[PDB]
Amino acid sequence: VDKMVTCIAVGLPLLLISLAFAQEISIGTQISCFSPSSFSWRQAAFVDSYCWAAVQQKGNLPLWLHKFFPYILLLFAILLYLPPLFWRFAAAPHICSDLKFIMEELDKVYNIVEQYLKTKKNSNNLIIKYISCRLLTLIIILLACIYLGYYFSLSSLSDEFVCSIKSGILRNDSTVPDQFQCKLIAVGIFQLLSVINLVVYVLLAPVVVYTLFVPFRNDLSLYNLFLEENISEVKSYKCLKVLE
Amino acid sequence: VDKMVTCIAVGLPLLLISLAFAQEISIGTQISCFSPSSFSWRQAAFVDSYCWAAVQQKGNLPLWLHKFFPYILLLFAILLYLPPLFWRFAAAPHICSDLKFIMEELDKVYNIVEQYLKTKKNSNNLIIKYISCRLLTLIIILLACIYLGYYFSLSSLSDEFVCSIKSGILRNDSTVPDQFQCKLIAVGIFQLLSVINLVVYVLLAPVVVYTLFVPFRNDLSLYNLFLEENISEVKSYKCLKVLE
Amino acid sequence: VDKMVTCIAVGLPLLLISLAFAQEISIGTQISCFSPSSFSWRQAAFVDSYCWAAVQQKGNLPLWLHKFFPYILLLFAILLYLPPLFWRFAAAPHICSDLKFIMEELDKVYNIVEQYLKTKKNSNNLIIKYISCRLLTLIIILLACIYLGYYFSLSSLSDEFVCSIKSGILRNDSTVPDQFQCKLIAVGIFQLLSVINLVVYVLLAPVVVYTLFVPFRNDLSLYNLFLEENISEVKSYKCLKVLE
Amino acid sequence: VDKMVTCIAVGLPLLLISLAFAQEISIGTQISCFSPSSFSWRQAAFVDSYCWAAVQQKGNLPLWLHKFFPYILLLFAILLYLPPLFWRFAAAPHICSDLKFIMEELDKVYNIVEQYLKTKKNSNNLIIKYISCRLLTLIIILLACIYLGYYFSLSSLSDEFVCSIKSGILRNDSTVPDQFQCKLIAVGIFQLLSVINLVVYVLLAPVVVYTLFVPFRNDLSLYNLFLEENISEVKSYKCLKVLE
Amino acid sequence: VDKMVTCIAVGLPLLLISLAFAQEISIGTQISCFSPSSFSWRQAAFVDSYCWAAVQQKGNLPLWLHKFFPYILLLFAILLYLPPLFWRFAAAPHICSDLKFIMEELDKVYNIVEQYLKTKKNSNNLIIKYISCRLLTLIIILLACIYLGYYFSLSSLSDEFVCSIKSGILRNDSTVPDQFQCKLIAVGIFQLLSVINLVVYVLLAPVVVYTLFVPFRNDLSLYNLFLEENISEVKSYKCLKVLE
Amino acid sequence: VDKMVTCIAVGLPLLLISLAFAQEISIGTQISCFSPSSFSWRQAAFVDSYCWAAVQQKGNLPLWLHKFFPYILLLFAILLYLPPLFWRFAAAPHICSDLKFIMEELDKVYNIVEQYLKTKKNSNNLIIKYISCRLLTLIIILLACIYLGYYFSLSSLSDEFVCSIKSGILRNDSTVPDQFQCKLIAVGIFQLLSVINLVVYVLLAPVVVYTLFVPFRNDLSLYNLFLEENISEVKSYKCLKVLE
Amino acid sequence: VDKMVTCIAVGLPLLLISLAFAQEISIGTQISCFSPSSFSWRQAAFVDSYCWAAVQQKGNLPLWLHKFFPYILLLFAILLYLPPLFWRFAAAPHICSDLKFIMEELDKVYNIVEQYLKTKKNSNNLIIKYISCRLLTLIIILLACIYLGYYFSLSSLSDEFVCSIKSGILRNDSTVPDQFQCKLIAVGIFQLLSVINLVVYVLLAPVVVYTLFVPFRNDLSLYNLFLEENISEVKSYKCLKVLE
């Protein structure tokens, strides 16, 4: 119930990037500048190479984002991978054996543990590790959500821009016409990828805060709720009840 | 009998998409605009890049669908994968052990369970999980069915459209002829893929509602019907009868 | 003897399709229209893209089949896969254990089963499942056989056709010459693939109906014939006889 | 000694086909027609596409074979695979256990079988299955041998032929020069592949008929000769002799 | 806690290089020189081949780094791999058995080791191997950090440079215009890769020196801290305490 | 000591062929004819296709070898594979058990075999199988050695030759200039591959004849020398001696 | 400690070659000759094919090395693989059992070997096999080191050379301009690969001679030093000491 959130919050940005690259290769380069009819095949591939590199040199913040939208979406994916990567390396040895301990000792009682819960309750160290692995996960969803909302928010006739190559010794020339109407290509594919990654991230925002309500769902309030999720040995206690 | 429906309702849209891409690569780009004879090789590849991106900017709803038909068909495939993905994570631990429990205890009787069914009958919690995993599956087939029917319903001379590139600084020019008869290419392959995915989805519509008739097929009406499907231990009870 | 038929009736159409695609890639596009000498490299690739898409818009039934011959051959392959896919999911648990049952109980007799066959004989439920898995297999071979015969039956100078692109705003022009002699390319490879898939399917037509003669080959007439095919425990009964 | 023949009679045609395709891709298309200097890049690729398809429409039998030489060599490879595929599905269960039977019972004699051979001798059913799996293998080598000899027998200036494209509406024109000297390319690679597949198939022709001399090599004449080939339990009988 | 640092300090430079090459292939060559309109397709590919090779022959140190930025980033990755490669080949046999030794002998005490720690404390040979495997790791991070900071520090209009090909017999000619404004392409992708590899390496600099504080975290100060990390047998000593 | 010769006499020709193909693809076609400036792109690819096929039609023996040098080197590789392929199928069952026989019986003597060697000595059947598997291997090295020496022996300005295409209806024309200076490309790579495959095959020629001196190294002279190579049970007889 | 040297002395030349080929493919052919503007696309690809083959025909020794630098680096890699390949086939059976022999017999002493070392000391046969496997390894590093130093030593404007194609019937012509300024491309990548393979091979030269000091590190001087490297049974002798 909690591993499924951190697999569709990471796997879904990975799926859209791989689908974007099969669309990126099957059409061509992400820029396409309208070179004049006088240029050759190589000079017309110079302008598509210059203008794709010169979107950063001087709003300008809309144009800079379209180049790196697969990268920022990638960085927001591996940064959701690290709280589960740190959960398996910090709080996994402290939880694997102690669930095995209660799983074996409850067999011999029906064939101590009542004073186990009285002293494991007052320990505010492992519930703090649990919420900080999910509160950091919650805000990094919303930072990814506000970026995905901002990228869709522009949505304008903004992929079209005007660049020029007359910078170096090409300045003060008589062949280049000083203006090149370029246009980014993959914007419309990215605008739809910025929506279906936003609606999912909005629909998972009540679910991730539903895990932050473990009394309604101290350390006993954490520990009593984990035993019926990944441990099938509690299901034999219902076999005690159904016979009577 | 129920895993076979959710494998051919998901595997069949996956098969058509992979066959479409081998047809998409082996011919070329999905758009092909008739550029003039005056244009170069690069300006003629500008118009195929502009017009393929400018189908969304202003019926228009036929033309927008042809670009994203592999994507909408993909989204309708993974959304049929989630009710079985949630079935293996919610109702699978509550059903694996209790079928193992009756599978072992019925051996020692011929070598209790009669009062097991009297109290497992009045429990309207796990039949509700069963129908909601299939009723949500039923309507999401019909929403996929009505989209596939609507895409085939247009079928017109609608792939041909007229676009223009005179928008930015290319506006007020004297070389571009203001109109470009473009045409989408993969429409005829998609119209046949929208039929053989519709006839299958119509032919599976009585089957998925046939699973929604579990009395004619409460919790006992659910639980008595599962034991002769994935459990071979009931076949020894016929070995009790055939000897007598 | 019966798994070998449903592997060469499915594997043989799969082998011809994979061999066709290596021939399809190594030559080029399946259409090749004779564009005029006045056209550019891109306008000449427009006509090959328009005419390959416009074979369906208005005999015409010969020309429509040549585009989709790998698809119809593919659909006739997976539709032969489903009666064995349903045999392993419906009649496989009802037959795996009961063959194991006689395989063990006949050991202890020489170290009941004589009254086993007297009551398993009068059961017309599992022989009906056996013939319907093969009678449906028989007619779907003949429907595939009559399509393969019809595709070879045309064999004419029919790949050559005449198309025109003057439809949209390209209508009422003065550059396009109103007629384009196109020709499909992979027809001659497909005509030979339609023969060696027909001669095999004719030669397997007496074999598949030879399985439909199980008395000369009720439920006892089905059940007595399966035990000497996939079960090596009957071979020890000959070791009983050869010692005497 | 007999599995090695049916692996180099099948693996050797598979090896030459894979080596031919790496030579076929690394050079180009198998046809190369000398288009005029007036034609464009696309019209010159029309003639290479028309003439490669129009070798069948009206000696002509030399030219038709050069297109399908990888296919006929492939069909002669899988048709040598079927007598071993039928040997493992028909005569393999009748021979696996009975060799295991003598392999175990001869241990306890030195720790019946003398009357085993007196009644297994007069059985003309399994030697008939053995020779028909090899006599059918023998003639299908010679049919492959006479085709490989006939293909090498032409060896002429026969790849060069003259084709014309003036058939449809291209007939009665004033631009096409009515004759196109084409030439197949991979003929010289195929002529050498038709020799080293002929010398091997001639050198294996005495070996395959050497297996057809099982008295000099009834059912006892078959059965006594198999026990010292795939069965290492006969080697302990020499350990009986070497101690004495 | 220490294997996670040496996997994200090595895996993160490996991830950026693989992402850079998919961006390097999908656009084109890293150089793009503006050849004149008079040149052919091959002479214009000469200048892109000459100028990409002639960045080293005579500041110049900015231009030389842009060619080899994937190589220097690769060399700084495998040089972080060698202190863990030497740790598993030098100090791994001296630590695998002795942790197994205390793991077994502490079972039989509750079912010597108190004098074990009194003589294993005064041994300054294995703590010296531990710090030198991490102090060498610390400075090689900072040398990688100062290079990544220096590469981002230039960030100028420095990818644009001017080269000339008039060197050999091409000197004293009348066709080449003596100057070619070239421009490297992947600089802007590399400038962003030089930032997200710098912020991570700064944020890991307090963590790697936090491992260099093993008293606050002699040989006993090393050995007492390893037993509760990779060894689950110490968790049973808490099972001694929780029962009392 | 003898498996290492037949792995570097087979693996080394396989390694050079795979390295040749990566050089063959990365440059282009093996022929490159200097077509005139008047020809188009397709007619200039006709001459490279005609002349590459017409090296066999009429010294001429130098030019024919350069086309098929990867094939003749391949045929000399699989022909060194067959004496080890026949050794594992003819003399392997007669040698696996009898080495296992002495390996077990010598344990119980120290816990018959002295009369074993007196009768296994006079058997001139299995030493004859041993030398003929290596004498046939020896001469097939020298035939491969003399071909590799002859190919390097030409080494001339012999890749350059003159071909003409005026054969069929292209004869009696007025456009083709009757002579085409072609040149094979991969000759210089092949001349170096013909040296490092010759120096190895010369340096292995004393080693393969060193195996043909088994008295200085009858059947006892063969059998006594095999027991200390692949059998570790003879090493315990030194443990008998080192204790005394 | 000695397997790590022969894995980074072999794996490091393998890594640079694979990185060179990804740079070789992503740019183009290793030669790039400045063909005139009059030549076609095919004649300009003739000169790049002629001049790349004609670097050997007549300092000249610098130019010949640049073609075969990946091959000579490959030959120096597999020649470091053969002393470990011969170590596992000659001195591995004589060392696997005798280390197992002392590993078992020392258990029963604490639960002969003192006279084992007195007679295994005076045996100068297996130490001679040890040094010759490493002395041959030492000089073949230095021969690889002096070649790598010599290749970096040239480093000049030496990739640029002048070739001509007027050799055969192309001699005495009036179109070719008699001189072609070519230039090798991958030289600058190879000059950096010749440095980082030299600094490693210099830094491993004291390590490989450190293995040649086995008294300071006869047969006892060899045999006493191997037991604490790959054998964990000596670590129990410290468990004898730490208890006392």
Numbering used by the authors:
A (entry chain F), B (entry chain C), C (entry chain E), D (entry chain D), E (entry chain A), F (entry chain B), ...: 34 to 91, 99 to 151, 195 to 300, 326 to 352
What does the paper say about this structure?
Pannexin 1 (PANX1) plays extensive physiological roles across diverse fields of biology, including cell death, inflammation, cancer progression, and neurological disorders. As suggested by biochemical analysis, PANX1 forms an oligomeric channel for the facilitated diffusion of ions and large molecules across the plasma membrane upon activation. The overall structure of human PANX1 presents a novel heptameric assembly, which is distinct from gap junction channels (connexins and innexins)8,9 and functionally related channels, such as CALHM and LRRC8. Interestingly, the protomer of PANX1 shares a similar fold of four transmembrane helices with the aforementioned channels.
Caspase 3-mediated cleavage of the cytoplasmic CT tail irreversibly activates PANX1 and triggers the release of the “find-me” signaling molecule for dying cell clearance. Cleavage at the S2 site is essential for the activation of PANX1.1 We generated CT-cleaved PANX1, named PANX1ΔCT, via Drosophila effector caspase (drICE) cleavage. As shown by SDS-PAGE, PANX1ΔCT was partially cleaved by drICE at the S1 site, and this result is consistent with caspase 3 cleavage. However, the dramatically deferred monodisperse peak of PANX1ΔCT observed by gel filtration (~1–1.5 mL) indicated that PANX1ΔCT underwent a large conformational change or that reasonable disorder regions were removed. We therefore collected the cryo-EM dataset for PANX1ΔCT and solved its structure at 3.1 Å resolution following a similar image processing strategy as the full-length dataset. Surprisingly, the two structures revealed almost identical conformations except that the density of the intracellular region of PANX1ΔCT was weaker. Interestingly, the channel gating was observed in PANX1ΔCT, which indicated PANX1ΔCT was highly dynamic under the condition of electrophysiological study.
